[PDB]
Structures are given as structure tokens and as C-alpha cells.
Amino acid sequence: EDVLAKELEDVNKWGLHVFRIAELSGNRPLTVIMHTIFQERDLLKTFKIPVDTLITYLMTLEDHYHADVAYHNNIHAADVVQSTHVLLSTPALEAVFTDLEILAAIFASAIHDVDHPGVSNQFLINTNSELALMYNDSSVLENHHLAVGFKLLQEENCDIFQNLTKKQRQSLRKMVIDIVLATDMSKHMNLLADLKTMVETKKVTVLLLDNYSDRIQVLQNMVHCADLSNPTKPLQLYRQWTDRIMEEFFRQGDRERERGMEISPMCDKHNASVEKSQVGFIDYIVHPLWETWADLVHPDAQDILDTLEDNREWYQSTIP
Amino acid sequence: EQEDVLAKELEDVNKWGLHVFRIAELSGNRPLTVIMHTIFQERDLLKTFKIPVDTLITYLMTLEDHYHADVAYHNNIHAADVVQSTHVLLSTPALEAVFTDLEILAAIFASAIHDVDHPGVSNQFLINTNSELALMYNDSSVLENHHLAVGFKLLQEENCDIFQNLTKKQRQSLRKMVIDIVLATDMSKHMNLLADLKTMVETKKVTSSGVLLLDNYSDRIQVLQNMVHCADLSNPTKPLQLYRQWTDRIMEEFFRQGDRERERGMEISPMCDKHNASVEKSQVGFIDYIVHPLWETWADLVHPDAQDILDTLEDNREWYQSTIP
Ligand SMILES: COc1cc2c(cc1OC)[C@H](CCCc1c[nH]c3ccccc13)N(C=O)CC2
Ligand SMILES: COc1cc2c(cc1OC)[C@H](CCCc1c[nH]c3ccccc13)N(C=O)CC2
Ligand SMILES: [Mg+2]
Ligand SMILES: [Mg+2]
Ligand SMILES: [Zn+2]
Ligand SMILES: [Zn+2]
Secondary structure, eight states, X not given: OOHHXXXXXXXXXXXXXXXXXXXXXXXXHHHHHHHHHHHHTTHHHHTTOOHHHHHHHHHHHHHTSOTTOSSSSHHHHHHHHXXXXXXXXXXXXXXXSOHHHHHHHHHHHHHTTTTOOSSOHHHHHHTTOHHHHHHTTSSHHXXXXXXXXXXXXXXXXXXXXXXXXXXXXXXXXXXXXHHHHTTSGGGHHHHXXXXXXXXXXXXXXXXXXXXXXXXXXXXXXHHHHHHTOXXXXXXXXXXXXXXXXXXXXXXXXXXXXXXXXXOOTTOOGGGXXXXXXXXXXXXXXXXXXXXXXHHHTTTTTHHHHHHHHHHHHXXXXXXX | OHHHHHHHHHTTXXXXXXXXXXXXXXXXXXXXXXXXXXXXXXXXXXXXXXXXHHHHHHHHHHHHHTSOTTOSSSSHHHHHHHHHXXXXXXXXXXXXXXXXXXXXXXXXXXXXXXXXXXXXXXXXXXXXXXXXHHHHHTTSSHHHHHHHHHHHHGGGSTTOOTTTTXXXXXXXXXXXXXXXXXXXXXXXXXXXXHHHHHHHHHTOOBOTTSSBOOOSHXXXXXXXXXXXXXXXXXXXXXXXXXXXXXXXXXXXXXXXXXXXXXXXXXXXXXXXXXXXXXXXXXXXXXIIIIIHHHHHHHHHHTTTTTHHHHHHHHHHXXXXXXXXX
């Protein structure tokens, strides 16, 4: 238990040893990382959240991530939380999202994949699942993650927002919904188009964002970047994330095959190239996103972008 | 002979101003079932889509049961009214041969399910009271998402899948169209929906047959969305004896919601305070700011097909206005 404390001192750094923390914490990475970030940002006193209510909620939330899902589990949630925490500190901003906006982005990251079944929205839609029937084929999983994340606040001693004012709770709820809904992959291109627009019309002294519409757009893109941050991490971490997403994909492709459905991209294990898929994912999705981002906050996050380009070069070299 | 009178009244199914409250009584509180069945036969939809008649009746009766008989406005009579109004709007000369049988089926089915299981309170009330529905749907088109989920879920009950003989592509296309239509009945979408309809009227293209030219999904679904939205907001365009009954019913629902808001210490929603209400001024305002802007634009789209409907709306506005001084 003291090596865990040592691991947590790198909470403000890109490349935290999140898999080690998951092992040392007894598969409680989301709980410990969240507890550490709330202390570090002084959110428990800022919003008057009792420490025991925080722990109770975090453990209940963590329990609703599936332990038999290789990628979309509590370790991924903890990673996205911690990554958002670092991006919130990019100098190109500095103290410029409200404290409520900071709490919303961090809470949204923690709940953003809760109760994920390990299959895609398209799978849930094409299989006529109960989830897709409930949500009318529209951001099916993301709507569900939000509903679960908020519903768990109503469990015994779980309301970490009990001492927020009524206005604050309403504002936070809207921001959290806006952020998590933006993690739907089908919204990526519009999100990226808007982020580009913002960069081109950027005003700085540091970024000056006067209207809520632009600020929520940045927070949406921020958590999206954090969700798509695996290829920007030290390679030892990135390779583990690749192993886990491919396990999840292959298990879904097997289900598509058996049902006679078209197999989803990268999900056919008999015609799969893991490394080519990573290079293509970086080239078409992750690098455009992170380059645009790095432009927005230029020239901060050059170290993050440096790692992404190193990792792209390495994966390409593994292709004969 | 009760059935004979009912059959006589259903001969008016192609007319604006159908005696829908009489049909509700004569059918034993089954206006949605009998009006939908009549329209499906009139449009030959059972034959076209190979819908077994017993399956249709079973689904309709189950759907109708899931409207709340104890809500004054958002009940099965309102659903039957919106269905029949959509059916008349679909028959307008300016749209002859414009929509496929599948699009027609989608618009009518959407109208039938569009308020199912409505609790008689607004989306904002459900959001502000932290309801289970608003929690499920993240404060976004809360009721309309629920109406869709219930309407589709009921197709899975015993002998209720009226779409059992559609192709897979037909079912996929119908499902998407129905979702797009019912979500457009959310009041928060009205201003953008109307702005788009105005843009279409200003840029409208007509064929050599004289009918509307709609050559992409965006334009086709937009017309169907606004059509069902007009049907939903059609009460002030109906003969006055119908309109006044709809006004009585919505005010009962509004006042009951206001009584709940008042008891909870909430600010009372507009038109919901029975101690500070003007029913007549509220109807004139509703017409002037919402219903007439919408219907004048629809009438422009299908000109001159809807002139009589617009004339009735304007007469009814003048009538309510005349009761204020
Ligand atoms: C470590 O490598 C991976 C990690 C993850 C993914 C893919 C990876 O490698 C190809 C997929 C991407 C699939 C397509 C997709 C999902 N969201 C998107 C947003 C924008 C564009 C595409 C997508 N994820 C899906 O949940 C996120 C996690
Ligand atoms: C007979 O009179 C009425 C009938 C109905 C309404 C209001 C009436 O009289 C004021 C309300 C309107 C409230 C606010 C509202 C709801 N949707 C809208 C769409 C656009 C603009 C406002 C609204 N309805 C709500 O379900 C439809 C039924
Ligand atoms: Mg997700
Ligand atoms: Mg409705
Ligand atoms: Zn995620
Ligand atoms: Zn309605």
C-alpha cells in the first residue's frame, strides 16, 4: 500500500502508471484516482463534498463498470479522468473554466462509459437490443452511461452534490450531459469541425472564450481527446490499450459473424491487422484531433503530440 | 344500431372536422383503433404491407390502452385526432404521388404513437421534479423519446407486430422515419422546425404535375415532420365546437399541473395557474405566436389546398378575441 502512494504523485503527469495503480489498489483505480484528483484540485472543500460520500459513490460507480470487459472498464474510466485532469491544466487556458466547469468535466469523465457491455452502438442498434429500443437508436450507450451515473447518486450516502445550490446542480447536470453525449463516435467529425473553427477564430492574450457555447465545445473536445488519448501515452501503456480494445472488438465480431451480420471494421479476427488498424486510426482520427487540439493550445501539449508521432512511427515499423 | 351510427360517422374520415368525440363514445372509447383501422382500409395498407387484420386490431387496442384514460387532453382521443388530421393532410393535392406507401405508413403510425403513455404533465415539469423519465432521457425530448420507446416496444407483444411482413430494409427505413417524426413533436424544436419550413417554402420546387418536388431524405422527412406537427397543433383550425372542447381539455391538464407545481413550491408554468388564468387571451396568444405562423407557412407550401383550414383558424382567432373585451 505505500507503492500506491508513490504511484499517485504522477497524477499531474501524462503517462501515469494506471495499470500498476489498478493492481496495487485492488482493482480500484477509478476510486483512488478520483479521490486524489479531488484533493489536488481542492474540490471537496470548494463544493463541500463529504469525503465518505465521495468514497461510497465512487466505489458504487466503479462497481458498475464490467470486470469482464477488456477495454471499457474501470481502468479506462480512471485513465480518462486522469487525462482530463491534465488537459484542464494546459497553460493555454489557466484558471479559465469555472470551478463548476472543472467539476463537470471530471465527473463526466468518471461516468462516461459506466455499465458498458463491450459492444458498439451499431451492434446494439442492429441487434434490436433493449438499450437501442429505449434510446431510439440515438447515442444509445452514451445516454445509458449518463442515466446510470446520475441514478447512482440516489443510492444510500452517494449524493456527492448534496451541498451544491439548486442552480449549481442544474448547471452541472446540463454540462455533464453535453460532455458525455459528445463522446459518441458519430459526433467526432462535427466536434472536430468546430474545434477547427475555434482555432481559426481564436482570441488570446492564452485563450479567451467568452460564450458558453464555445467553452462547452472546448470541454467536449477535451474529454473526447482524453477518451482518444491511448496512442499519445508512453508506448508501454499504449500497447496494453491496443491489446484490450482488440480483445473487445474480436469478441464482438464473432457475434456479428454468427448472427450473419456484416462484421464491423477491425472486428474480424481472421482478416485482422492490429498494427495497420492502429496506424490508420492515428492517421484518420487521433492525429487530426490532437493536432487541432495542439493548435488551439499552441505550443502546449507538444510533448503529448511528440509521443503520438513517435508511437505512430513505431507501429508503422512493425508492419513488414 | 350503435354500430350503424359509428359506421356512418366514419364515412367522414377524409374530412377536416370529423366528429372525433362522437366516434370516441360510439366506439366504446376506441377512437384510435376504429379510426386507424378505417384509414388503413381506405389506403389499402393491409394489402400493401400484408398486415393481418387481427394483428392490426390487437396492436391498435394495446396501443390505445397505453394512452391514459384519466388525462383530459393527451389521451387516445387526441391520438385519434392527430392520426386522422395527418391522414387528411397527406391527401392534399399538392402532395399527390409524392410520398411512397412506406412514408405514408410511417407518418400515420408516428401520429398514432406520438403521445402514448403521456402522463399529462410537460417535459419541463418532469425535468424540474427530477422524474424517473427525465433521468432516463437526460432531460432531452423526455416525453417524445418515451412515446417512441413504448410505441415500438408494444409491437413485440403477442400478435402485435403489424410490420411482420415488411422487408428488413423497409423496417429499418420505417423505424428511422418514425423516430425522426415523433422527435419533431417536442415543443423545443418548433422554432427551428418552422424556420426550416419557411426556407423550404421560399425555395420550393414543383413538378410538371404541379406537386411538390422532394428529391432527398432531408426535404422529404422535413415535410413529414411538419405535417404531423401541424396535425398535433391543429385544434384551433377545427370547427369551433371541436376547438372549444380541446381548449377545455388542455386547460384541465394545465391547471392540474399548476396545482402540483403550487403544492411543491415551484413557479407555476405559463397558463397553468387557475387563480390567475385567462383562457381566452391564452388561446389568442397561442394562435398568434405559434399556430397561425405554422399553419400559414404550411398553407403556402401546399397552396391553395389549405385555404379553408387557414380561414377557419382565422375565424376562430377572431371569435376568441371577441370574448376578451
Ligand atoms: C487503443 O486503440 C483504440 C482504442 C479505442 C478504439 C480503437 C482503437 O484502435 C483502433 C475505438 C475506436 C473505434 C471507432 C471509433 C470509436 N470512437 C471513435 C471516435 C472517432 C472516430 C472513430 C471512433 N473506440 C471505441 O470506443 C475507442 C477506444
Ligand atoms: C387547445 O389549445 C391548446 C392545445 C395544446 C397546447 C396549448 C393549447 O392552448 C394554449 C399545448 C401548448 C403548450 C406549449 C407548447 C406545447 N407545444 C408547443 C409547440 C410550440 C409552441 C408552444 C408549445 N400543447 C402541449 O402539449 C399542445 C396541446
Ligand atoms: Mg464511450
Ligand atoms: Mg407530444
Ligand atoms: Zn471511453
Ligand atoms: Zn400531441
